[PDB]
Structures are given as structure tokens and as C-alpha cells.
Amino acid sequence: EEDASQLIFPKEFETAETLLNSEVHMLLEHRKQQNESAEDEQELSEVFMKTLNYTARFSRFKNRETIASVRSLLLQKKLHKFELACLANLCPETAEESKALIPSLEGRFEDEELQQILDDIQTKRSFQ
């Protein structure tokens, strides 16, 4: 009934606002730092640890100013929240790969403008 290839989401996931992997890393490390203080509170879930180390391994934007810059440059582009977050998380390098990993980008942007946006991603990727 649902399909992420054509943005086919449930009605519960209509007001769903996406998050970046470095956003999830920053906020869950802030929650872990809140757990480090404010004692007589136990350790969090196994889900917390697994999600936190998972998005710590796959984090691409090492600065929150990088997060804000990518969010400002992509939010002014006519995308859905889902397409925006999936582009800024997978980070493709060719516009063919941008249309192949996300088949709902077929004809949303021009492929030269799409390659400009992907080169802006590879410009704003914090390298390791």
C-alpha cells in the first residue's frame, strides 16, 4: 500500500518531518550527555545505543553549521522532505545515481541543476 519510490506514504506520515544523520547523532549525543548528568536515572535503551553508534558511523556532516548550510541550500529547493533527507544522507555523485537511488526525482529538477546540487553536496561534505 506504501511505496517510498513514488512518495507513497501513510496519512500518519504526512506531517512527518525528516532528520539528517548528523542531526540524529548530535541530538542523541546531547541526550547521552543529559544521561551522564542528572543522576538517579538509568541507562537508556539498547535501541538508543544502536541508533547512536549507527548514525555515528555513517555521519557525513561533522559541523552543525554544515547541517544548517546544507539545510538552507536544500530547503530552498523544490523537494519533498523525504527526497531532501535521502539526498543529504546517501550523498550521490552522479545525477544518474541521484535518479537511480531515488526514482521519485525523475524530472523534478533538471539533471544539470541536479548535478549542481550534488556537487554542492560534495562541496559541503565534511571529509575524513
Binding site: 557525513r60 550523498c91 561534505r125 571529509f127 575524513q128
Partner: protein, 278 residues
């Protein structure tokens, strides 16, 4: 673990390494007292209770012994200082990485205590042990290895084995990789510097005899043979250890840019070592 340590203070196992920085660089003097090895994970203790009953512990009194999830076997009454290193084979999509036990130092080997033996001498017993527990007919087993130990005055030989390799999942960005004695490599985290000579002794180099000698700073005696009281036991080697971390901004291979000016490069550490060899 309490049986095998024979009443040795547990706090000895909790000591963190001293970070090597421009403020702590003077601690590696005299250079000949030291050995070094390339690290690929955090250091842990490992206890063998026989067969697959292998447990690890992170040195903190609060931490539980965790059962090791690796297909490997160790004799009972074995107590090791180790790290866990994944050995990548090939590069990129074809790259295959296998985790391996890397012994850093040894305390007890199948009920034989070795902690009071000299670091290289303890390592000599450790090296034989890895072959003893080896299983080459069983390629499904996780390997046990001893770390390659360098003389601190030969740290230059480590950087010749550092290569920039394409690791599976690095988005095509090459990562610093240390290549071992086989066709396997791991991502290094840094370099441990371990003192092998106990105070008041230290190792000099005699320019007239072209040989290293031991010097006692208290008695002023000099000898060309190893004094028994100059031997650094496990607890002195472990307590006195430095760690030179190799994170972002540190240049140890010529393809790395940019360098952080507050962090010791290969060139800074090698220059300091060269000035203090003489």
C-alpha cells in the same frame, strides 16, 4: 582474574595511557628505554578459561567481563593485554575485513606467570604462545597475533608501512592503513610507546664501544649486560605507557592535508628522537 593476579592491586589495570603531545614529548627520554607498536583499537584485558570460554574487560572496576564473540580458542589460566583489529583484505567493493586478536603484552600463559620478565622477553614468550594456539587447518577461526614491536629509535620503519587505501564504505576517500607482515592491513588509531627499562636504570649508547649500555642514575654504575633490577615488569610497562593518537589534523603520511599546528607530526617526533639518540 583475582586468582591469576595473586593479590596485585586491581587499580594497576585501570591506568589510562599518557597522551603524547608537545608538553609530554620530553617523557620519551632516554629514547633507548622505549619500544613502540601501532594500535588499531582500544586496549582491553582478555582472560582464557579454556576452549571458547574467552572474556574481555576494559580495565575499569565498574565494567563487567564480556564474553568474546569470536570463533577462537585459548588454554585455561591465560591472561593477556590485547586489542581487537579488523584486517581488511583488498580495497573498496572487493575489500574483505576480518577482525583479529592482537596481543599488546602478556601476564599469564596457561598458568605460567611471565609478568616480571623483560617486555621483549615477555613478548618472546607471547610470540611462541600465538603459534601454540594457532589453528591453520581451521580458516573459519578468528586469528590471534602478537603486535609488531619496534625500537623507539627505529620508529621511522613504521611510517614506511603506512599507505592510503580505499576502504569499503569510505565513499571512495582513501584512509590511512598500516600493512602487517601478511597482505592484511588495519586502520591505525595511533602508536603506543612502552618503557622497558625500570628506574633508576636507563639505556645509553657508547660511541667508543658502538654498543648500548645500562646506566644506574643513583649508583653511577655502567654495564653492557642486562641488570636484573633494570627489567621493567608488566605493571611498570602498563603504568608508564604513552599513546600518540593519530586522529584528524595529524600528519604521519605525506598524502595527509591539512595539519593542525597544535598536534605532533611524524617530523616533530622523528626530529626529537634524532636529537635524543646521541
Amino acid at each position: 582474574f583475582f586468582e591469576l593476579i595473586q593479590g596485585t592491586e586491581i587499580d594497576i589495570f585501570s591506568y589510562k595511557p599518557t597522551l603524547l603531545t608537545s608538553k609530554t614529548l620530553e617523557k620519551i627520554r632516554p629514547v633507548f628505554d622505549y619500544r613502540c607498536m601501532v594500535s588499531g583499537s582500544e586496549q582491553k584485558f582478555l582472560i582464557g578459561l579454556g576452549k571458547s570460554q574467552i572474556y574481555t574487560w576494559d580495565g575499569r572496576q565498574s565494567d563487567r567481563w564480556i564474553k568474546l564473540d569470536l570463533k577462537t580458542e585459548l588454554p585455561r589460566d591465560t591472561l593477556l593485554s590485547v586489542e581487537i583489529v579488523h584486517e581488511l583484505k583488498g580495497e573498496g567493493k572487493a575489500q574483505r575485513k576480518i577482525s583479529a586478536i592482537h596481543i599488546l603484552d602478556v601476564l599469564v600463559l596457561n598458568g605460567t606467570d611471565v609478568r616480571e620478565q623483560h617486555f621483549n622477553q615477555r613478548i618472546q614468550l607471547a610470540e611462541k604462545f600465538v603459534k601454540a594456539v594457532s589453528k591453520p587447518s581451521r580458516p573459519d577461526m578468528n586469528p590471534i597475533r602478537v603486535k609488531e614491536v619496534y625500537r623507539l629509535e627505529e620508529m621511522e620503519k613504521i611510517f614506511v608501512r603506512l599507505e592510503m587505501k580505499i576502504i569499503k564504505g569510505s565513499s571512495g576517500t582513501p584512509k590511512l592503513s598500516y600493512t602487517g607482515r601478511d597482505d592484511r592491513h588495519f586502520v591505525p588509531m595511533g602508536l603506543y610507546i612502552v618503557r622497558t627499562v625500570n628506574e633508576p636504570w636507563t639505556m645509553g649508547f657508547s660511541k667508543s664501544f658502538k654498543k648500548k649500555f645500562f646506566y644506574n642514575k643513583k649508583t653511577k654504575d655502567s654495564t653492557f649486560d642486562l641488570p636484573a633490577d633494570s627489567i621493567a615488569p608488566f605493571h611498570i610497562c602498563y603504568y608508564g605507557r604513552l599513546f600518540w593518537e593519530w586522529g584528524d589534523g595529524i600528519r604521519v603520511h605525506d598524502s595527509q592535508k591539512p595539519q593542525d599546528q597544535d598536534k605532533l607530526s611524524k617530523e616533530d617526533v622523528l626530529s626529537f628522537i634524532q636529537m635524543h639518540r646521541a
